[PDB]
Design an enzyme around this catalytic site. Structure first.
Site, PDB file in Angstrom:
ATOM      1  N   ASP B 289       3.153  -8.355  19.583  1.00  0.00           N
ATOM      2  CA  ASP B 289       2.713  -9.704  19.179  1.00  0.00           C
ATOM      3  C   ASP B 289       3.629 -10.838  19.716  1.00  0.00           C
ATOM      4  OD1 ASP B 289       0.891 -11.367  17.500  1.00  0.00           O
ATOM      5  OD2 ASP B 289       2.808 -12.050  16.565  1.00  0.00           O
ATOM      6  N   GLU B 331       0.069  -8.839  24.715  1.00  0.00           N
ATOM      7  CA  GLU B 331      -0.835  -9.958  24.548  1.00  0.00           C
ATOM      8  C   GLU B 331      -0.004 -11.178  24.962  1.00  0.00           C
ATOM      9  OE1 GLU B 331       1.204 -11.982  22.163  1.00  0.00           O
ATOM     10  OE2 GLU B 331      -0.374 -12.037  20.642  1.00  0.00           O
TER      11      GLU B 331
HETATM   12  O1  LIG Z   1       0.699 -18.493  19.801  1.00  0.00           O
HETATM   13  C1  LIG Z   1       0.494 -17.538  20.694  1.00  0.00           C
HETATM   14  C2  LIG Z   1      -0.935 -17.437  20.734  1.00  0.00           C
HETATM   15  O2  LIG Z   1      -1.010 -16.268  21.386  1.00  0.00           O
HETATM   16  C3  LIG Z   1      -0.847 -15.253  20.536  1.00  0.00           C
HETATM   17  O3  LIG Z   1      -1.735 -14.235  20.997  1.00  0.00           O
HETATM   18  C4  LIG Z   1       0.485 -14.624  20.424  1.00  0.00           C
HETATM   19  O4  LIG Z   1       1.386 -15.194  21.173  1.00  0.00           O
HETATM   20  C5  LIG Z   1      -1.211 -15.723  19.142  1.00  0.00           C
HETATM   21  O5  LIG Z   1      -0.217 -15.534  18.436  1.00  0.00           O
HETATM   22  C6  LIG Z   1      -0.096 -14.319  17.705  1.00  0.00           C
HETATM   23  O6  LIG Z   1       0.885 -14.610  16.853  1.00  0.00           O
HETATM   24  C7  LIG Z   1       0.669 -15.580  15.840  1.00  0.00           C
HETATM   25  C8  LIG Z   1       1.978 -15.636  15.105  1.00  0.00           C
HETATM   26  O7  LIG Z   1       2.275 -14.381  14.617  1.00  0.00           O
HETATM   27  C9  LIG Z   1      -0.546 -15.297  14.919  1.00  0.00           C
HETATM   28  O8  LIG Z   1      -0.894 -16.407  14.176  1.00  0.00           O
HETATM   29  C10 LIG Z   1      -1.699 -14.792  15.819  1.00  0.00           C
HETATM   30  O9  LIG Z   1      -2.713 -14.264  15.090  1.00  0.00           O
HETATM   31  C11 LIG Z   1      -1.141 -13.718  16.779  1.00  0.00           C
HETATM   32  O10 LIG Z   1      -2.110 -13.111  17.540  1.00  0.00           O
HETATM   33  C12 LIG Z   1      -1.141 -17.236  19.247  1.00  0.00           C
HETATM   34  O11 LIG Z   1      -2.347 -17.780  18.810  1.00  0.00           O
END
Ligand SMILES: OC[C@H]1O[C@@](O)(CO)[C@@H](O[C@H]2O[C@H](CO)[C@@H](O)[C@H](O)[C@H]2O)[C@@H]1O
Ligand SMILES: OC[C@H]1O[C@@](O)(CO)[C@@H](O[C@H]2O[C@H](CO)[C@@H](O)[C@H](O)[C@H]2O)[C@@H]1O
Lengths: 651, 651
Positions: B289, B331
Site C-alpha cells: 500500500d 500499487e
Molecule cells: O494516495 C495514494 C493514492 O494511491 C493509493 O493507491 C496509494 O498510494 C491510494 O492510497 C492507498 O492508501 C490510502 C492511505 O492508506 C488509502 O486511503 C487508499 O485506500 C489506499 O489504496 C491513494 O488514493
C-alpha cells in the site's frame, strides 16, 4: 464420468504409495511427490498419446528408474537442481556464451579439458558442449554418432569418473556441461543390436526389421535420402538378422546406425535411464540428436510426427522430476511454424524443450553474405511465430555439420526470389563455383536424382579468408576478417545463447588433411572439424594484428559488450525493422529500459542509410554499444562502411 | 581492489557461518545458503543503496529474523514454496482470476469466508484479496488503512489462527490469499507512535517529527495534497509530541496516519518481520500500500524516489529467501515509464515486484466509455515500455478507491486532445454533471486551489445502470448491461490477472446509506464499498434475465472463455493495432499457436469496421472465441453492434 474418475483415483494413489514407500526421509518423499504433481500430467498424458493403453502398465517400471536415480543423485547435484529452480532464466542471461568442441580435438582427453578451463573462462564461456563422447563402434563411427555403449566414455577420452570430475570442475567455473543424447539410433555393434541379431525377441523389437523389400519399398516411396553418398536409402540388408538369410533394418543415416523403434515403450525406458544416469554424472543440457526422426509413419517423410513432441515432453518431465537442473535442446531442421512445436506452445500442455537451434538465422547469415541482399533475411525472420518467453534459441555461425540451404519457397517469393534458384546459387557460391565468390567450401552429399547439395567448410574458409590468404591481397584479407566479425556480432546480439564453434575465434581454415585419414576420407564434414591450434592461440594472444588475431580480439570485445548489454535478455525476441536499403538488416529489441536497434551492413559497399528509420524508433540522440561513440539521427543519413555493425540505444 | 575484496570475503564468510550455526539439519542450511546466494546481491546492494555504510551493521539482525522465520515456517508452507518454484508462471496462467473484498462486507468474519468458498470456486477465483484486516484504530480508520497492530486480526473478524485456517482452506481450493502490507504509515494509536509521544527516542526515530513549521513549510512547497478534504497538507500538529507544547508529524493521508521513517533501517527490519510473520500465516501475495510514498526527499513530491525500488527489492529478497511462495504487488499511480521500475528492468539488478496494477487501463476504459473515442486509449497503451516477461499486470474495472483521471498531457496531445480539458470532461461526465451522461458518481476530494477532482461510484452506477433503472427505459438498461460486460471483457482478455471487485458480478449500485454511518459519512468512497447482497446472488442464480442476472451470466461465460484461451498467457503483452474507426479498439496478442485480435466497440453505434485491418493479421477465416461463431474477413466490413466485443483467432 464416475467409472473413469475412480480408475484415475486408484492410479494416483498407487503412484503416491510407491513414492512414499521408497523414501525413509519424508521431506524427500514430499519433494518427489510435488515434482510428480507438477509434471505428472505432462508425463502421463504425453505417454498415453504415444503408447495408448500400454501406458497403464508403465508407471511402476518408470517410477522405479526415477526413484532410484533420485536416491543416486549426489548432494551437490541436488543443490544445482535447487539453484536452477531459483534462477529459471539462467540460459537467457546476456552473460551466457557457449563453446562447442570435440574433446579429443580441443584437449585430447577429458582430463586435458580440465587443463584448459582458464582458456574457456577467459572467453566468458558458461556452456560447454562436448561432441559425442560415449563409446562408439570401432572404425568409422560418424564422429561419435554411432554409439556402442551409452554407459561408458570412449576409452581414449577417459572414464565416467573423469566425466564427472570434469563436470564438477566446470561448475566451479560457472560452466554447464552439455552433451548429445543420440536417441534416434545406435551403432549396429551396440549390445541391443547384437542381441537382436542373435535372435532375442525383446531386442528385435528395439529396431525396425523387415523380412524382404515389401515394407522397405513401401516406406521409401515417401522418404528422403539423408546420406545418399554413404548409404543409399533408409534401409540396410544384414545377413545375421533372422534365422535364414538376413533381413532389412531401418538405417536413416549410415548402414551401421540402426534406427530405434520408439513405438516400443522399452526404448523410452532405456533412454529415461540413460538421461538420469548422465545427469547424475553432471550433465546439465542434453542435445537431442536427430530428434525429428524418432517416429516412423507410413506415407510420411517420418520426420516431425506429433509423437516426437509427446515423447520429448515425457522424456523431459521424467528427467526433471528427478533432476530439475536438466534442460533439453532440440536440433530439428523444419519450417518455422513447426520448429516452435519443439519448444512449446504456451497452451494446456507442458513445455517440450528449453532450447532449439535457430538454423534459419545461420542459413540467412550465409545467404545474405553471398547475395549482399537482406530482403530474404527479413522475410525468413518475419515467418516465425513467437517462442514461449521462457524458452531460448541456440545461435551459431557454424557447427560440426555441413550446411543445408533450408530456405522456403514461400519466404523467397515474398522477397522477390525463386527459392530453388536461390538455393542453387548458394551452393554454387559456397562451393566456390560462382565467379568471384570469396568462399572455399566443398559439396557434401550431392544428390543426382534431385540435384540437392549441401556444403562443408569452416567459417573462415567460407567467409573468404582461405581464398584471401592465397591471393595475399590486403583488401580481400580485410573483407574476410570483417565478414567473420559481422557473422559473430549477429549471433551475439540476436537473443539466445551464441554457440561458438571451436577455433572460429582463431579463424581456423579448412583442414584438407581429412583425406589422409581412412575413417574420415569419405566424409568431407571433417574438413571443418580441425584439431585445436594451441600454438596459434598463443600467437594471437601475443600478436593481435594478424588476421586470426583481429578475429580473436574483435570477438573477445563483442563478447564483453554482449555480457553488459541488458537488452539481450533472451526472453525478448528481435523483430525485423524493414530496411529501406537492401544491403542492410535492421533488428529491433524492445526492453524495459529502452529499445535497441541493431544495424548490419551485409555488403562490402558503404551504405548511407536514411536516418529516419532509426530516429523514428530511438529518437535524435543514440549511442553505439559496440564502438562506444554517438550518432545524431537528425542528420539525413548514417554512414555504414562495409560490414559495419551498430548496436544502438537511446542517448 | 584487494583491501575492498578482503572485507567482502570476511562478510560473506560471516554470513555463511551464522546460517550454518542456525540449522542442525544440513539440507536446511544448504537450502538457506543457496537462496542467500541467489538473492544476496539484490538484498545487500539494494540495502547499501539506501542505507550506505550502516548496512554493514545490519546482516546479523536481519539474518536473525529470516533464520527464525525459516525455522517457524510450517511444512505445508515449505511445500507451497517448492510448488511455486516448480511453476514460476503461476500468476500468468489464463485460469488465474482474482476477487477483492472486505472480509466483513463479503461474509462477516474470516470463518464466514470459509463458508463461501463454493461461491468463489464456482466463479473460478484462484486469488482472493481481502482488504486490510489487521487491528486498526477504533473509530474512523480509513477502512482498515490506519493499522494499530500488525500482529493481530481486527477482533470482530476473528484471530490470526482463523486467518491461518482460512488460508489453509483456500489452498485446498487452489486459491491464493492476498493481503495489504500497509508499509508507508501506521495509526497514531500504534504502540510505535504511542512510544514516540511518550518520549522514547528509538520510536521517535520511526516518524518524521518537527519542532515547528520550518521543516514542514519547506517540504510543503513541493508536495501535493492527497486528501485536502480530510486533513489539509501533509503535516499534522500533535500536542503530546515532545516535552513542551507538541510538534508536527508527517501525515500524507489522514491526520491519524503517521508516515514511517524509511530512512531508519529499524523500520525496514520491522517490516521484514511483519511480512515473514504474515507469510507464515499463509499469505501468498502482498499488496504494498502507498509504496510510492515511502521515501521523503526535500524539493520533490516525495513519490517514486529511487529508494522506493531499492527498499521494495530488499524487502522482497528477504521475504523469498525464507518463503519463495511469496509475491509482491505494487500499487503506484505514475507515468508508464516509471511504473515499469516497480516491476523490474531486466538488467543487472533483481526483480522489484511480481505484479503491478495497470491503472492506466482502468482509466482508459472509463475514459473511452465516456468519449466513445478510442484514440487516447491507443496512445496511452503505446506509451508503455514492455514489462519483464516474468512479471504480471493486475487489471481492474473498479476497486475500493475513487478514480483519479491519470491521463498525461503527452498521450492526450498525440490523440489530438488537450489533457487538462479531457480530464475536466471526465469528472463532469462521471459526476453526472455533463448533459446526457449515463453516469452516477460522486465528486471526491475536490481541490479548490487547482480544481482537481476524483470520482467515487460503483461500476454499475458509473456505467449507467443506476440511472437506467430510475428511468425504467429498456434501451438505457440494455446499454448499461452491455457496457458492464464490455468493461469486464477487456480486463479478462488484456493479459494479466483480472481483479473482480466484490459484487460487480451482481452489478451492485452506489450504496448511499454510507451517509448514515458517522465513521463513513465524510468519505464518499464508501458509496462503492457495499455489503455483499447474498439474496441477490441467489436471485440471479435462479432468475438470470434481470439486469444483474445478465451481468452475472455474461461475466461467468467470459471467465470460462478466458480460462480456455491460451493466448491470454500474461508473458505476452497486448499491442495496439491502430483502428481505422475511432469508436473501436483493436488489440493484438502474438502467441506460439497463432495470433489473436481482440476487437472492442466503445460506442452504442453499429460500427462497420473495414475488414482488411483484421485480415492482414489473421487471414480470411477467423473464429470468435466469445460467441463461438465465424467471420469471413474477405467481405469488405465486419459488423459490430453497440459495445460488441470479439476475440478473434485464425480458422
Ligand atoms: O494516495 C495514494 C493514492 O494511491 C493509493 O493507491 C496509494 O498510494 C491510494 O492510497 C492507498 O492508501 C490510502 C492511505 O492508506 C488509502 O486511503 C487508499 O485506500 C489506499 O489504496 C491513494 O488514493
Ligand atoms: O539428418 C539430420 C540432419 O539434421 C541433423 O541435425 C540431425 O537430424 C543431422 O543429423 C545429426 O545426426 C547425424 C546422424 O547421427 C549426424 O551425422 C550429424 O552430425 C548429426 O548432427 C543431419 O545432418
Amino acid at each position: 464420468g464416475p467409472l473413469g474418475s475412480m480408475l484415475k483415483d486408484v492410479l494416483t494413489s498407487e503412484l503416491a504409495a510407491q513414492v512414499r514407500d521408497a523414501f525413509d526421509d519424508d521431506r524427500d518423499a514430499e519433494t518427489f511427490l510435488l515434482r510428480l504433481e507438477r509434471y505428472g500430467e505432462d508425463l502421463w498424458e504425453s505417454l498415453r498419446a504415444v503408447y495408448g493403453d500400454q501406458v497403464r502398465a508403465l508407471p511402476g517400471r518408470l517410477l522405479e528408474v526415477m526413484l532410484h536415480a533420485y536416491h543416486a543423485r549426489p548432494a551437490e547435484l541436488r543443490r544445482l537442481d535447487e539453484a536452477r529452480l531459483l534462477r529459471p532464466d539462467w540460459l537467457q542471461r546476456p552473460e551466457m556464451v557457449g563453446y562447442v568442441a570435440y574433446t579429443d580435438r580441443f584437449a585430447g582427453t577429458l582430463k586435458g579439458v580440465e587443463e584448459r578451463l582458464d582458456y574457456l573462462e577467459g572467453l566468458g564461456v558458461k556452456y560447454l558442449h562436448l561432441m559425442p563422447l560415449l563409446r562408439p563402434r570401432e572404425g568409422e563411427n560418424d564422429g561419435g554418432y554411432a554409439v556402442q555403449d551409452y554407459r561408458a566414455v570412449r576409452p581414449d577420452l577417459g572414464t565416467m569418473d573423469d566425466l564427472s570430475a570434469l563436470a564438477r570442475a566446470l561448475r566451479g567455473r560457472g560452466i554447464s556441461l552439455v552433451l548429445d543424447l543420440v536417441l534416434n539410433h545406435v551403432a549396429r555393434e551396440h549390445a541391443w543390436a547384437q542381441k537382436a541379431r542373435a535372435g532375442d525377441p525383446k531386442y528385435r523389437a528395439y529396431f525396425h526389421l523387415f523380412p524382404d523389400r515389401r515394407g522397405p519399398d513401401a516406406f521409401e516411396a515417401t522418404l528422403p535420402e539423408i546420406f545418399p553418398d554413404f548409404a543409399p536409402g533408409n534401409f540396410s540388408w544384414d545377413e545375421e538378422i533372422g534365422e535364414g538369410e538376413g533381413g532389412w533394418v531401418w538405417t536413416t543415416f549410415n548402414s551401421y546406425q540402426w534406427d530405434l523403434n520408439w513405438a516400443n515403450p522399452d526404448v523410452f525406458l532405456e533412454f529415461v535411464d540413460i538421461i538420469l544416469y548422465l545427469a547424475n554424472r553432471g550433465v546439465e543440457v542434453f542435445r537431442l540428436d536427430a530428434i525429428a526422426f524418432i517416429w516412423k509413419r507410413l506415407g510420411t517423410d517420418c520426420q516431425n510426427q506429433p509423437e516426437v513432441h509427446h515423447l520429448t515432453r515425457a522424456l523431459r518431465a521424467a528427467a526433471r522430476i528427478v533432476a530439475p537442473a536438466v534442460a533439453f535442446k532440440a536440433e530439428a531442421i523444419v519450417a518455422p511454424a513447426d520448429l516452435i512445436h519443439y519448444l512449446g506452445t504456451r497452451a494446456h500442455h507442458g513445455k517440450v524443450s528449453d532450447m532449439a537451434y535457430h538454423n534459419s538465422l545461420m542459413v540467412q547469415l550465409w545467404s545474405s553474405l553471398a547475395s549482399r541482399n537482406t530482403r530474404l533475411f527479413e522475410e525468413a525472420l518475419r515467418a516465425f511465430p513467437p517462442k514461449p518467453t521462457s524458452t531460448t534459441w541456440g545461435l551459431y555461425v557454424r557447427c560440426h555439420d555441413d550446411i543445408g540451404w533450408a530456405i522456403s519457397d514461400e519466404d523467397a517469393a515474398r522477397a522477390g526470389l525463386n527459392g530453388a534458384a536461390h538455393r542453387h546459387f548458394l551452393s554454387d557460391f559456397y562451393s566456390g563455383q560462382f565467379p568471384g565468390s570469396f568462399a572455399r567450401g566443398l559439396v557434401f552429399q550431392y544428390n543426382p536424382v534431385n540435384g540437392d547439395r549441401r556444403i562443408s567448410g569452416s567459417a573462415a574458409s567460407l567467409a573468404g579468408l582461405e581464398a584471401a590468404l592465397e591471393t595475399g591481397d590486403p583488401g580481400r584479407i580485410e573483407d574476410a576478417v570483417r565478414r567473420l566479425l559481422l557473422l559473430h556480432t549477429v549471433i551475439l546480439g540476436f537473443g539466445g545463447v551464441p554457440l561458438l564453434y571451436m577455433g572460429d575465434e582463431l579463424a581456423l581454415l579448412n583442414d584438407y588433411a581429412f583425406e589422409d585419414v581412412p575413417e574420415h576420407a569419405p566424409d568431407n564434414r571433417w574438413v571443418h572439424r580441425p584439431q585445436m591450434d594451441w600454438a596459434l592461440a598463443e600467437r594471437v594472444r601475443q600478436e593481435p594484428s594478424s588476421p586470426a588475431g583481429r578475429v580473436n580480439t574483435g570477438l573477445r570485445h563483442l563478447l564483453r559488450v554482449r555480457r553488459d548489454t541488458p537488452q539481450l535478455h533472451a526472453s525478448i525476441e528481435s523483430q525485423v525493422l524493414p530496411s529501406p536499403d537492401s544491403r542492410a538488416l535492421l533488428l529491433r529489441r524492445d526492453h524495459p529500459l529502452g529499445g535497441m536497434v541493431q544495424v548490419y551492413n551485409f555488403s562490402e559497399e558503404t551504405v548511407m542509410l536514411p536516418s529516419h528509420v532509426l530516429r523514428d524508433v530511438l529518437g535524435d540522440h543514440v549511442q553505439d554499444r559496440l564502438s562506444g561513440s554517438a550518432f545524431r539521427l537528425d542528420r539525413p543519413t548514417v554512414r555504414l562502411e562495409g560490414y559495419r555493425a551498430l548496436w544502438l540505444t537511446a542517448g
